[PDB]
Design an enzyme around this catalytic site. Structure first.
Site, PDB file in Angstrom:
ATOM      1  N   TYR B  26      33.308 128.346  52.608  1.00 38.05           N
ATOM      2  CA  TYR B  26      33.325 129.276  51.494  1.00 38.05           C
ATOM      3  C   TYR B  26      34.411 130.320  51.697  1.00 38.05           C
ATOM      4  O   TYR B  26      34.714 130.723  52.823  1.00 38.05           O
ATOM      5  CB  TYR B  26      31.964 129.963  51.319  1.00 38.05           C
ATOM      6  CG  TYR B  26      31.678 131.029  52.349  1.00 38.05           C
ATOM      7  CD1 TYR B  26      31.172 130.696  53.596  1.00 38.05           C
ATOM      8  CD2 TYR B  26      31.910 132.370  52.075  1.00 38.05           C
ATOM      9  CE1 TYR B  26      30.908 131.663  54.541  1.00 38.05           C
ATOM     10  CE2 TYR B  26      31.651 133.344  53.015  1.00 38.05           C
ATOM     11  CZ  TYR B  26      31.149 132.985  54.245  1.00 38.05           C
ATOM     12  OH  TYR B  26      30.887 133.953  55.184  1.00 38.05           O
ATOM     13  N   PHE B  36      37.234 139.181  50.627  1.00 40.30           N
ATOM     14  CA  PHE B  36      36.427 139.925  51.584  1.00 40.30           C
ATOM     15  C   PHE B  36      35.810 139.062  52.673  1.00 40.30           C
ATOM     16  O   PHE B  36      35.446 139.603  53.723  1.00 40.30           O
ATOM     17  CB  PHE B  36      35.307 140.699  50.870  1.00 40.30           C
ATOM     18  CG  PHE B  36      34.269 139.823  50.224  1.00 40.30           C
ATOM     19  CD1 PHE B  36      34.427 139.383  48.923  1.00 40.30           C
ATOM     20  CD2 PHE B  36      33.121 139.462  50.912  1.00 40.30           C
ATOM     21  CE1 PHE B  36      33.470 138.586  48.326  1.00 40.30           C
ATOM     22  CE2 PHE B  36      32.165 138.664  50.320  1.00 40.30           C
ATOM     23  CZ  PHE B  36      32.339 138.227  49.026  1.00 40.30           C
ATOM     24  N   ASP B  37      35.678 137.755  52.466  1.00 36.83           N
ATOM     25  CA  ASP B  37      35.092 136.879  53.468  1.00 36.83           C
ATOM     26  C   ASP B  37      35.613 135.467  53.259  1.00 36.83           C
ATOM     27  O   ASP B  37      35.924 135.068  52.135  1.00 36.83           O
ATOM     28  CB  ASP B  37      33.560 136.894  53.402  1.00 36.83           C
ATOM     29  CG  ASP B  37      32.918 136.349  54.660  1.00 36.83           C
ATOM     30  OD1 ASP B  37      33.651 136.068  55.630  1.00 36.83           O
ATOM     31  OD2 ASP B  37      31.678 136.200  54.678  1.00 36.83           O
ATOM     32  N   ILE B  56      22.370 135.346  50.532  1.00 38.81           N
ATOM     33  CA  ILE B  56      22.092 135.984  49.252  1.00 38.81           C
ATOM     34  C   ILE B  56      21.650 134.930  48.245  1.00 38.81           C
ATOM     35  O   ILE B  56      22.063 133.764  48.306  1.00 38.81           O
ATOM     36  CB  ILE B  56      23.327 136.753  48.751  1.00 38.81           C
ATOM     37  CG1 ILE B  56      24.535 135.822  48.713  1.00 38.81           C
ATOM     38  CG2 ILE B  56      23.602 137.951  49.640  1.00 38.81           C
ATOM     39  CD1 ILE B  56      25.743 136.428  48.032  1.00 38.81           C
ATOM     40  N   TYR B  82      24.192 141.754  45.622  1.00 40.20           N
ATOM     41  CA  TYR B  82      23.888 142.895  46.476  1.00 40.20           C
ATOM     42  C   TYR B  82      23.218 144.060  45.763  1.00 40.20           C
ATOM     43  O   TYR B  82      22.884 145.047  46.426  1.00 40.20           O
ATOM     44  CB  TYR B  82      25.161 143.390  47.177  1.00 40.20           C
ATOM     45  CG  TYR B  82      25.441 142.659  48.470  1.00 40.20           C
ATOM     46  CD1 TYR B  82      24.566 142.756  49.542  1.00 40.20           C
ATOM     47  CD2 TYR B  82      26.566 141.860  48.612  1.00 40.20           C
ATOM     48  CE1 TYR B  82      24.808 142.086  50.724  1.00 40.20           C
ATOM     49  CE2 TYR B  82      26.816 141.186  49.792  1.00 40.20           C
ATOM     50  CZ  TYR B  82      25.933 141.304  50.843  1.00 40.20           C
ATOM     51  OH  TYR B  82      26.177 140.635  52.019  1.00 40.20           O
ATOM     52  N   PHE B  99      32.900 133.072  44.760  1.00 36.63           N
ATOM     53  CA  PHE B  99      32.930 132.265  45.968  1.00 36.63           C
ATOM     54  C   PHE B  99      33.522 130.901  45.652  1.00 36.63           C
ATOM     55  O   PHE B  99      33.086 130.235  44.709  1.00 36.63           O
ATOM     56  CB  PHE B  99      31.523 132.095  46.544  1.00 36.63           C
ATOM     57  CG  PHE B  99      30.922 133.365  47.062  1.00 36.63           C
ATOM     58  CD1 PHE B  99      31.311 133.886  48.282  1.00 36.63           C
ATOM     59  CD2 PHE B  99      29.961 134.036  46.328  1.00 36.63           C
ATOM     60  CE1 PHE B  99      30.754 135.053  48.758  1.00 36.63           C
ATOM     61  CE2 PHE B  99      29.402 135.203  46.798  1.00 36.63           C
ATOM     62  CZ  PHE B  99      29.798 135.713  48.014  1.00 36.63           C
TER      63      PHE B  99
END
Lengths: 434, 107, 592, 263, 186
Positions: B26, B36-37, B56, B82, B99
């Site tokens: 991902y 961010f990731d 999540i 979130y 994502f």
């Protein structure tokens, strides 16, 4: 001068105050680096003794009172109106000198910085003011790097005010240094300060410069120039194909780039217009190019999702056929023979258009321009001419780099000056005057 | 609150059964396009057990709606990613997440 | 080089390439400009695409003054001429804009009253064209970051634009989006009724409803016919395109009108709910200009092009991956190669201090902050910064320190605290320990050999921001230690080899910038104890080939190093002595 | 000839650097000469290391590792400003150390590690933080005092080691005397445990320490308790609550093993 | 360079003189190098005297005397290993009544006008301890009770006897040879 007792009878020794402030700054000037060790130690001892005597006589409170009495006024023009000219053009200098004197008084003195803890809250409240921002920042830096008790009183609001100073005044590394002093002092970390600074500075991604690793992107084009003009002899409709033999979706941690379409020059100039020439940008990343990645229509570095039967990102064994219509400005795509439910239109037609593909590493593609320069896997729409027919009789159809510079030896690289405008690409027979 | 767009089709038959372990690659992006990731950055496939509250719920549902070998774009609203609190230091409050998820293997 | 001119510069990196050096220059004692360099010299070149930058204080034509907002007058940024009406004074259209943009909403929804005032997402600014300046030569509106069209004959009919049309399979157009980079209206056309401009100058107000992405213009209190519909998430920079026909040209008045926020509220997040107009120093007037350079990349993508056949067409192939580290300026919506910061002195310093702040916020075992920072600086970025040879020295040192602090400092300090303590379990492995490897009393290489003293356990937590386990905030984030150690060994070997000849092109610009971060990383890895056996033997041979051989090529200990490098070598030798003491203690226990 | 030894390599490298350049860095000079002294003092390294070496059987490896990890956490808590999370971490670390059996069966290991000293500087730093006004983290301070008292009770050698820090504890014996339910968790209690039932330590007790205790007792007998009267207790002219604590410490000082120390 | 490092550390303005393991180690090294310890003949005695002079010159030609004075001044009347090693090194340099070392020390003191040196000297003399009958009686009572001292022998009676002896020996060596100038200066 305050309390509405304004008159010329008042005594305001502006020149005397300025001269005394300069003398005090010279008196508290720290020793220079080029001095010998013994002289430096003696000067440091004398300076510390002077600071201790001044603190015991309570000079810091007097300087703070003078600073407050000066900040009761909004600006130099206001102070000039209230008191007079000489005060007006001495206000800023006197305030800066007072802040410098305070910094010199408390610099390097643990006791003085500890005593300044109570007044720290009053000091931070005026950072936003342009006149006193630098002086307050320097004083705060000295106090924080000297006294742990200074850090023991800093709360969330003060850190938020400092970050707002960053947000409203710009990129100042002294603010970052102050934040570092807030985070760590004397080899002891403060979890509260660290967490507050992190949570109130990093997630925004709006003040600090952002870093990212980006694939290099190259762009390639045939030596074909398509343009529409009044009195021109250029066919309006054009068609070409690209077939992808192989493409690796992820050669690196970043997704592979592969876009196909048409790009325009800037007013009969052979080189592509309005685009970055080294890397990171491809077709559709400006308003001069129009691309298709298999899922989106790219133009102006903005992507809009577009529908197609069994829509997918461009992969192996994909045939993408691009159609350009300069009569009614339009760009259309067909993937594997079925139409793509999206179109570019009403774009600028004052330049020259050419087929173009942009890519990162990990592709193997083949231009099909028709004729002996490739065979179309499909039938071009009626009234659409294949791109190989646009080659000039003297020119030879070639696929070369869109930009001037490519991977070569340094001493064999051909540095190029500005190129002459390619007016001969579009032919307009011009009459004699009648 | 999760909406899914195909990128590379999967087999279309095998789907994550309850109690299975989904293995994915991902890449996480905010709505503005700032990463961010990314598991591909760490060069390690991300394994998580379905229905066991490990990730999540937006990513949970997005992976549930995905076939083996598929690649998809999952958009998760704040209420499924979130909420109003956000993730301190990384995701701002009330942030919609995107994502790019590839379902490598199911086990 | 002028029009249709082709040149080639030879800096003499390879002396054999120079063809006229021997005839004149070799005997006279002239060295080639790249006589002692291990890398190709970076070549900069004039930028073809104009860019926006702040108006210099010493500009010969433009002067900008910032009138502070009074109790009755809104804040003003006044754009004015310097040398109008004089010799060789440039009379051309100049493109001014504000440093900060207004960003539209992510999703488009489909006396002033205080509640509506606070809840609105509509922002206003105004441009006052002064009397005596022809409005026909002034354009007022908005631009995006994609605007780079420097044309002396600007008109609204040549604005770059496109229309994206999206429909379903059966035609039936669903949406049509007009996209451009300039959203302005001419002041001359916008006037309409001819007036004397005596009560006030022309006051064109620009209004953006960001919740709907709507751009409207007001001439003298009446809404103009022209309007624009921008896409979601569009960043519009307030701007004015003005041709100077008067000394005083115009004013960016950052005020407000009834039931509308000022521009500062949109620009600054801190003042989002503040209806009071403001002009913070970050907001300044930038202008389009050509005085700036571009950095030519040291390596391009390798592209193979070949006409396969008449049937197959033209093959374009690219397989070798290349990447560059991109630095993004948020308030300008632009990006630049981070290698270009070697000539951007202010950005380089600010980014170095940002890296120092990144180190500080996670200093001394703040694992939660370390995981948070792993989102902003990831492993590919760290590895690229470590390997890259053209990185500025300050950024190189900052990134080395950031890597060490995020991933290695915690365990390094944890083992350093125990280093002076010797807890030896008494097992068969301990009993097998001897002072000397064999009967020949020759010291073994420090570090190698069996060691049984108790040491802290090394564990790391994988940083993932999709999980909600809330248990990874213990232990530092995981890093590819095997890749790190191999790459560090290879890099240090290259550094030794290239510095033995003392080249004029060290990595980072100085030999200290070359050696201090790399030796610091190697020392941290040694302290953590990742190196074992073969790697330790290789690196000890690098340190000193003569003494550390297993039974000119000069090691670091005799390379004429600077003082910081000497200090780091002292640290390494201290660690080696500590390892020898540890081995002695273990052998003593074994005999005991 | 070639050095062929790390000792010789280091010695001649340091000498060569020092005689080749005038080093402008005091830190570099210090490191160079520390290395040279280490090379020339090989026996000194063993003299410094053997006091800090310790051997264990193969059975206790796991819980020794657990103890070392807990002590490492406590030591890492030194370089962090004291807070609520730090208090929680210190309390759980001390609890784990107490629960570990090696703390009971290897007092010499604890003394060599100097973990009692580590808790000592934790407490002194926290007391100094807000020494003038009411101290913070009373729960953590009480836990540290209980740990020190337990350390004293473990063995006589630990008792002497803690007695070596008697002067500071009597200096700050007024930490939590007024607060009830904190009894047995005070620096005065730690001092009493260090001087408890040990005749040689009672002998080593000197006049200045007892003078300080008597001065505190006199102050308590002369003035009331500020924090009691702040809570709202009647303002009598003396401090029985703290006076009892000081009298108890004097009792422990003068009475040991059922017999009175005459001097 | 080493002596200059120590001198700079001593001259640095500090509230208290921190312990320096490097300083103790190298002060001991230099003191041992100086002293380097059937009746010997006059030739042998002269050889030993001249060798001692050369060894003392090796140090006092590089600032050792000024280093000793600076460290004593920075001690500020606090007894410890710092001042103990400093006094031992001073004795080693001044052994035999070295006129050159005495002259160097007197010249440095006069040109620096170091009141701190004499203040620290008086503080050290005041901090020097004497016999403690109370401690002796307590230790005798402990021995009578029979409690075995696993630790070192109780030295609480006349703790720093060697330090007192070396301080006063340094004072005597400063005046040996009837050095009238420094005798009056004291």
């Amino acid at each position: 001068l305050s309390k509405k007792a304004k008159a010329s009878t008042v005594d305001l020794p502006i020149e005397s105050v300025s001269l005394s402030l300069q003398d005090l700054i010279g008196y508290f000037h720290p020793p220079d680096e080029h001095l010998e060790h013994e002289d430096k130690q003696n000067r440091l001892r004398a300076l510390k003794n002077r600071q201790n005597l001044f603190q015991e006589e309570g000079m810091i409170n007097l300087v703070l009172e003078c600073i407050d009495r000066l900040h009761v006024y909004s600006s130099a023009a206001h102070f000039a109106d209230v008191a007079g000219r000489e005060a007006g053009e001495s206000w800023k200098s006197i305030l800066n000198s007072l802040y410098e004197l305070l910094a010199a008084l408390i610099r390097g003195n643990r006791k003085n910085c500890a005593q300044f803890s109570g007044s720290l809250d009053w000091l931070i409240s005026r950072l936003e003011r342009l006149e006193a921002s630098s002086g307050i920042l320097e004083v705060l830096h000295c106090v924080l790097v000297e006294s742990p008790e200074a850090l023991n009183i800093i709360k969330e609001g003060h850190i938020k005010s400092i970050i707002s100073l960053l947000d409203k005044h710009g990129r100042n590394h002294k603010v970052l240094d102050v934040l570092c002093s807030l985070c760590v002092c004397h080899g002891v970390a403060v979890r509260s300060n660290q967490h507050l600074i992190c949570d109130n500075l990093l997630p925004g991604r709006d003040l600090l410069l952002q870093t990212r690793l980006v694939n290099h992107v190259s762009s390639m084009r045939p030596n074909i120039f398509l343009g529409v003009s009044e009195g021109s002899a250029q066919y309006k409709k054009w068609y070409y194909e690209l077939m992808v033999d192989h493409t690796e979706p992820f050669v690196t941690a970043e997704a592979t780039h592969l876009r196909v379409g048409w790009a325009s020059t800037e007013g009969y100039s052979p080189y592509p217009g309005g685009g970055e020439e080294w890397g990171g940008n491809g077709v559709g990343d400006d308003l001069f190019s129009y691309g298709f990645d298999g899922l989106h229509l790219w133009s102006g570095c903005i992507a809009r999702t577009v529908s197609s039967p069994n829509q997918h990102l461009l992969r192996t064994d994909d045939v993408i056929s691009c159609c350009l219509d300069l009569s009614a400005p339009s760009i259309s795509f067909r993937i594997n023979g079925q139409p793509v439910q999206g179109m570019f239109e009403n774009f600028n037609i004052d330049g020259l258009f050419f087929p173009v593909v942009s890519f990162s590493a990990g592709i193997k593609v083949r231009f099909l321009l028709g004729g002996r320069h490739g065979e179309f896997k499909f039938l071009p729409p009626p009234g659409y001419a294949p791109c190989y027919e646009a080659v000039l009789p003297k020119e030879k159809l070639k696929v070369e780099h869109s930009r001037e510079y490519k991977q070569e030896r340094t001493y064999t690289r051909d540095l190029l000056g500005p190129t002459v405008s390619l007016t001969q690409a579009a032919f307009t027979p011009i009459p004699v005057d009648t | 609150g999760v909406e899914i767009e195909t990128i590379s089709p999967g087999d279309g038959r095998t789907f994550p059964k309850k109690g299975q372990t989904c293995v994915v690659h991902y890449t996480g992006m905010l709505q503005n396009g700032k990463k961010f990731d990314s598991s591909r950055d760490r060069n390690k496939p991300f394994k998580f057990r379905i229905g066991k509250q490990e990730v999540i719920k937006g990513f949970e549902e997005g992976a549930a709606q995905m076939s083996l070998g598929q690649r998809a774009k999952l958009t998760c609203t704040p209420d499924v990613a979130y909420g109003a609190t956000g993730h301190p230091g990384v995701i701002p409050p009330n942030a919609t997440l995107i994502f790019d998820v590839e379902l490598l293997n199911l086990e | 080089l002028g029009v249709a001119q082709v040149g080639r510069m030879n800096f003499g990196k390879d002396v054999s390439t120079l063809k006229y050096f021997t005839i004149c220059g070799l005997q006279e004692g002239y060295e080639p400009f790249a006589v002692n360099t291990n890398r190709d010299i970076t070549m900069w070149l004039s930028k073809r695409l104009p860019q926006f930058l702040q108006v210099p204080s010493n500009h010969e034509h433009i002067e900008v003054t910032r009138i502070d907002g009074t109790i009755d007058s809104s804040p003003c940024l006044k754009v004015t001429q310097k040398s109008f009406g004089s010799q060789n004074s440039n009379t051309d259209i100049m493109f001014y804009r504000l440093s900060m943009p207004i960003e539209c909403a992510e999703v488009f929804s489909k006396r002033d009253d205080y509640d509506f005032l606070m809840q609105t997402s509509t922002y206003y600014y105004s441009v006052r064209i002064f009397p005596g300046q022809e409005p026909a030569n002034v354009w007022v509106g908005w631009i995006t970051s994609d605007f780079h069209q420097y044309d002396t004959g600007f008109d609204l009919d040549r604005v770059r634009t496109v229309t994206v049309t999206l429909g379903d399979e059966k035609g039936k157009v669903h949406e049509s989006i007009k996209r451009s980079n300039c959203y302005m209206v001419c002041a001359g056309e916008s006037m309409s009724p001819g007036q004397g401009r005596n009560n006030n100058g022309l006051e064109i107000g620009c209004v953006v409803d960001a919740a709907s992405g709507l751009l409207t213009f007001i001439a003298n209190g009446k809404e103009l016919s022209t309007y624009y519909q921008v896409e979601p998430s569009t960043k519009l920079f307030p701007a004015v395109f003005a041709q100077a026909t008067s000394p005083n040209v115009f004013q960016f008045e950052l005020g407000r009108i009834k039931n509308v926020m000022p521009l500062s509220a949109g620009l600054f997040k801190s003042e989002h709910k503040n209806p009071v107009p403001q002009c913070p120093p970050r907001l300044h007037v930038q202008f389009l200009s050509h005085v700036l350079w571009s950095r030519m990349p040291n390596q391009f993508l390798k592209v193979d092009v070949s006409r396969i056949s008449e049937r197959q067409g033209w093959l374009v192939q690219c397989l070798d991956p290349l990447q560059f580290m991109s630095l993004h300026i948020p308030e300008e919506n632009r990006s630049v190669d981070i290698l270009e910061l070697t000539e951007q002195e202010e950005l380089l310093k600010f980014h170095y201090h940002t890296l120092r702040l990144y180190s500080a916020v996670c200093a001394l075992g703040n694992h939660r902050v370390a995981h948070a920072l792993c989102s902003h600086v990831d492993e590919p970025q760290l590895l690229y910064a470590i390997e890259n040879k053209y990185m500025p020295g300050l950024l190189r040192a900052g990134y080395y320190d950031l890597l060490i602090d995020i991933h290695l400092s915690s365990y390094a300090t944890a083992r350093l605290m125990m280093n002076n303590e010797y807890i030896v379990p008494m097992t068969e492995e301990t009993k097998s320990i001897t002072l000397f490897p064999d009967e020949n009393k020759k010291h073994g290489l420090p570090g190698i050999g069996l060691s049984t003293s108790l040491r802290p356990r090394m564990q790391f937590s994988s940083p993932s921001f999709v999980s909600i386990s809330n248990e990874c905030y213990q232990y530092s984030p995981e890093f590819p230690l095997d890749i790190l150690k191999s790459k560090t060994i290879q890099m240090l070997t290259e550094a030794v080899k290239e510095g033995s000849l003392h080249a004029r092109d060290p990595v980072g610009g100085t030999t200290e910038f070359l050696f201090v971060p790399l030796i610091k990383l190697f020392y941290t890895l040694l302290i953590m104890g990742i190196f074992h056996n073969e790697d330790l033997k290789h690196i000890l041979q690098l340190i000193e080939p003569s003494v550390f051989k297993e039974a000119p090529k000069e090691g670091l200990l005799q390379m004429k190093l600077p003082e910081p490098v000497k200090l780091q070598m002292c640290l390494l030798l201290q660690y080696l002595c500590d390892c020898q003491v540890r081995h002695r203690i273990e052998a003593i226990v074994a005999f005991s | 000839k070639k050095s062929s030894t790390l000792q010789q390599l280091i010695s001649e490298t340091m000498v060569r650097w020092a005689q080749e350049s005038v080093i402008e860095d005091p830190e570099l000079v210090r490191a160079m000469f520390v290395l040279l002294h280490r090379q020339y003092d090989g026996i000194g390294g063993l003299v410094r290391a053997l006091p800090k070496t310790y051997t264990i059987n193969g059975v206790s490896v796991e819980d020794t590792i657990n103890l070392l990890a807990s002590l490492g956490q406590i030591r890492s808590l030194l370089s962090v400003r004291m807070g609520k999370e730090e208090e929680k971490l210190m309390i759980r670390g001390l609890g784990d150390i107490m629960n570990n059996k090696v703390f009971y069966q290897h007092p010499n290991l604890m003394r060599a590690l100097g973990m009692h000293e580590t808790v000592m500087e934790v407490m002194v730093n926290v007391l100094g933080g807000g020494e003038s006004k009411e101290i913070t983290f009373p729960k953590m301070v009480a836990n540290c005092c209980r740990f020190l008292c337990y350390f004293c009770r473990i063995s006589r050698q630990n008792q002497k080691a803690m007695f070596d820090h008697l002067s500071y504890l009597l200096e700050n014996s007024s930490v939590g005397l007024a607060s009830p339910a904190m009894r047995g968790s005070t620096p005065l209690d730690v001092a009493a445990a260090s001087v408890m039932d040990n005749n040689e330590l009672a002998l080593a007790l000197r006049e200045p320490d007892l003078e300080k205790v008597v001065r505190y007792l006199a102050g308590c007998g002369l003035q009331s308790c500020q924090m009691l009267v702040s809570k709202g207790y009647p303002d009598i002219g003396w401090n029985p609550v703290e006076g009892e604590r000081y009298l108890d410490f004097l009792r422990f000082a003068v009475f040991c093993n059922g017999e009175s120390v005459e001097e | 360079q080493l002596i200059l490092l120590f001198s700079r550390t001593a001259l640095t303005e500090k509230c208290k003189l921190e312990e320096d393991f490097l300083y103790m180690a190298y002060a001991d090294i230099m003191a041992k190098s100086c002293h380097d310890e059937e009746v010997k003949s006059f030739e042998e005695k002269e050889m030993e005297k001249q060798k001692l002079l050369y060894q003392q010159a090796r140090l006092h030609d590089r600032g050792a005397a000024e280093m000793v004075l600076q460290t004593i001044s920075a001690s500020k009347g606090e007894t410890g290993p710092m001042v103990a090693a400093t006094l031992k090194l001073g004795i080693a340099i001044l052994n035999g009544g070295n006129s050159t070392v005495q002259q160097k020390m007197l010249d440095y003191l006069k040109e620096k006008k170091d009141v701190g040196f004499f203040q620290s000297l008086a503080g050290l003399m005041q901090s020097c301890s004497v016999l403690d009958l109370n401690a002796f009686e307590r230790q005798n009572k402990a021995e009578g009770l029979g409690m075995v001292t696993e630790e070192g022998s109780g030295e609480k009676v006349l703790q720093d006897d060697e330090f007192t002896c070396d301080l006063f020996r340094f004072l005597q060596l400063l005046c040996e040879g009837h050095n009238s100038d420094f005798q009056n200066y004291l």
